[PDB]
Design an enzyme around this catalytic site. Structure first.
Site, short mmCIF file in Angstrom:
data_model
loop_
_atom_site.label_atom_id
_atom_site.label_comp_id
_atom_site.label_asym_id
_atom_site.label_seq_id
_atom_site.Cartn_x
_atom_site.Cartn_y
_atom_site.Cartn_z
N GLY A 195 29.98 42.28 37.89
CA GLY A 195 29.89 41.78 36.52
C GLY A 195 31.11 40.99 36.06
N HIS B 203 25.77 30.58 40.54
CA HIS B 203 25.00 31.64 41.19
C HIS B 203 24.29 32.59 40.21
CE1 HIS B 203 27.93 34.97 40.82
NE2 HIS B 203 28.90 34.16 41.24
N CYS C 147 32.22 38.21 37.53
CA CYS C 147 31.92 36.80 37.82
C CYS C 147 31.87 36.02 36.50
CB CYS C 147 30.60 36.68 38.59
SG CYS C 147 30.45 37.80 40.00
O1 LIG Z 1 30.59 39.24 44.77
C1 LIG Z 1 29.97 39.33 43.71
C2 LIG Z 1 28.55 38.80 43.58
C3 LIG Z 1 28.34 37.62 44.50
C4 LIG Z 1 28.50 36.32 44.05
C5 LIG Z 1 28.44 35.29 44.97
C6 LIG Z 1 28.22 35.60 46.29
CL1 LIG Z 1 28.19 34.32 47.47
C7 LIG Z 1 28.05 36.91 46.67
N1 LIG Z 1 28.10 37.92 45.79
N2 LIG Z 1 30.46 39.89 42.58
C8 LIG Z 1 31.72 40.50 42.42
C9 LIG Z 1 32.87 39.82 42.05
N3 LIG Z 1 34.11 40.33 42.07
C10 LIG Z 1 34.24 41.59 42.47
C11 LIG Z 1 33.16 42.42 42.85
C12 LIG Z 1 33.33 43.77 43.26
C13 LIG Z 1 32.25 44.53 43.61
C14 LIG Z 1 30.97 43.99 43.57
C15 LIG Z 1 30.76 42.70 43.18
C16 LIG Z 1 31.86 41.87 42.82
#
Ligand SMILES: O=C(Cc1ccc(Cl)cn1)Nc1cncc2ccccc12
Ligand SMILES: O=C(Cc1ccc(Cl)cn1)Nc1cncc2ccccc12
Lengths: 305, 300
Positions: free
Chosen positions: A143, A41, A145
């Site tokens: 961040g 992604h 990820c």
């Molecule tokens: O969720 C995403 C970005 C993302 C990646 C794939 C999909 Cl399908 C949707 N969004 N990153 C994050 C990862 N972990 C904790 C996180 C806390 C807060 C904000 C962002 C966080």
């Protein structure tokens, strides 16, 4: 004495963390030999994430679109390919800090250490378990990820998890290092919910053995149970079924403490039906399920890496 | 989202762990530049543990009596000195893996990561707080002596603890890296007991702010309290007195969540009175006191 939620020493993994940038998206990559692994992604826009065609998005990218930074050194990308939900960026330099490693897919209940990273820089290490619903109850911000989960077996780092996303309940979802998600999750910005979570029964029993090893015996009783009667009780309290495999795995702890696995199951059965009654076990008022039987033996015997 | 007891990445410290042997005693040492630091009790024998005269025991030692092993390489000891309860072994090789570091003495309530080691080999990393009674509730076995506690702030490793011993209650006592013990402890096998332990109130309040930041508000109430009335109640639950310093330290979290420190103090008073009633705060049925206000801001 003492019992802590202990992670594996993260040094061998810290030497592999790099920053991967694609356009406006910046996340973490795992640099092993001449390949950098990161969530696919990273090639998406916020609109692309809504309904992505990763083959179509990736075909439009060239090597120079991916900026890989190992510390303060830019690594030049010489190739790019996709394997399931992981992007593999072939780089010109093999990581000199590459440890002996394997890619392993873990089962729910198994634990691992997470090296949380932001901008290719490790910020913390914690232990956690792959929940029976395939999520992890991590601690992750924007961040994170690309941060990885791992175990260290002797001198070999077994990479088992790569962080991809946070679900609406605050729990986390990711893949093994071959890009296969744990759980019924997809890397798309859409409505996704984890299934109802259950307690990892074998892990609770392992933790009860650790409490006994540490001098906490108040919960022990003269009773024993059949494996079938205990599973009828476990199913009622949202506890995972305890298999004969689990009973075998708890054998060494059962022999060390002198408490048969089914005798410890009768303690757990009483704890589920009656509670702790104002008491604690290893400083906890809840039954801890994020220590496997191996973690307990490892911690109560001092295995080094 | 999420809130975990998180330790600092241990890599910078792993590169410093060495094995130190003196006669029959083998423990861990911290190799920084051309000096290896370890507990001075490494020079003690069986009947030289109740009342060891360390100056007398050390004067009888020569450099070749100390075997230092960094991985599978023996380091040559070229000097030895004692600074309080730490032995400093000057070696002929500077550790090439020496990170940017400082020696810091911490106050009770402060947290740090422990890299537990056996035979100069790291086996695990966990997060600790220096208890108000100056002990740490670690997880240590025989051979863990010399394992260190540290924080990593902006690339620099601040070493704050070196493990020396386990007290009869299973809690641990050790020194800063200058060999000064935390607490009224001495490196002798004499009868030693930690004072009654108390809850680190400022840390519980910091952790309640972390729960609010993470969307949990069930424990909040419409009440405020005076700092003095809070301390009168909290003291009855074996909580540490909350000072004006603590109230100031909680200021940023109070501003971020919009909940005044004395309002959060009233929620804490109510939680001590009512318990959780089957509820959890950040996945915990107990009030967590091993996250400082700085840890909460860092993690959130
Ligand atoms: O969720 C995403 C970005 C993302 C990646 C794939 C999909 Cl399908 C949707 N969004 N990153 C994050 C990862 N972990 C904790 C996180 C806390 C807060 C904000 C962002 C966080
Ligand atoms: O406490 C000692 C030995 C010692 C060192 C110094 C002095 Cl003055 C007296 N005794 N070692 C240990 C350290 N940590 C955990 C331990 C668990 C079990 C057994 C031994 C442990």
């Amino acid at each position: 004495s003492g019992f802590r939620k202990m992670a594996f020493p993260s040094g061998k993994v810290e030497g592999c963390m790099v920053q991967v940038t694609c356009g406006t998206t910046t996340l973490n990559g795992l640099w092993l030999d001449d390949v950098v692994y990161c969530p696919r992604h990273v090639i998406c826009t916020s609109e692309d994430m809504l309904n992505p065609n990763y083959e179509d998005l990736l075909i439009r990218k060239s090597n120079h679109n991916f900026l890989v930074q190992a510390g303060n050194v830019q690594l030049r990308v010489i190739g790019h390919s996709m394997q399931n939900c992981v992007l593999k960026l072939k780089v010109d330099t093999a990581n000199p800090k590459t440890p002996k490693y394997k890619f392993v897919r873990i089962q729910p209940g198994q634990t691992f250490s997470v090296l949380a990273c932001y901008n290719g820089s490790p910020s913390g290490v914690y232990q956690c378990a792959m929940r029976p619903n395939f999520t992890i109850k991590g601690s992750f911000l924007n961040g994170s990820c690309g941060s990885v989960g791992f175990n260290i077996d002797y001198d070999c780092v077994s990479f088992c998890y790569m962080h991809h996303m946070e679900l609406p309940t605050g729990v986390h979802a990711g893949t093994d290092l071959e890009g296969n998600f744990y759980g019924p999750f997809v890397d798309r910005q859409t409505a996704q919910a984890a299934g109802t979570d259950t307690t990892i029964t074998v892990n609770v029993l392992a933790w009860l053995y650790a409490a006994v090893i540490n001098g906490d015996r108040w919960f022990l009783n003269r009773f024993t149970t059949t494996l079938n009667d205990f599973n009828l009780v476990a199913m009622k309290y949202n506890y995972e079924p305890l298999t004969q495999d689990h009973v075998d795995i708890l054998g060494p702890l059962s022999a060390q403490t002198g408490i048969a696995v089914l005798d410890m199951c009768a303690s757990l059965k009483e704890l589920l039906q009656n509670g702790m009654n104002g008491r604690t076990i290893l400083g906890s008022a809840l039954l801890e399920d994020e220590f496997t039987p191996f973690d307990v033996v490892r911690q109560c015997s001092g295995v080094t890496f």
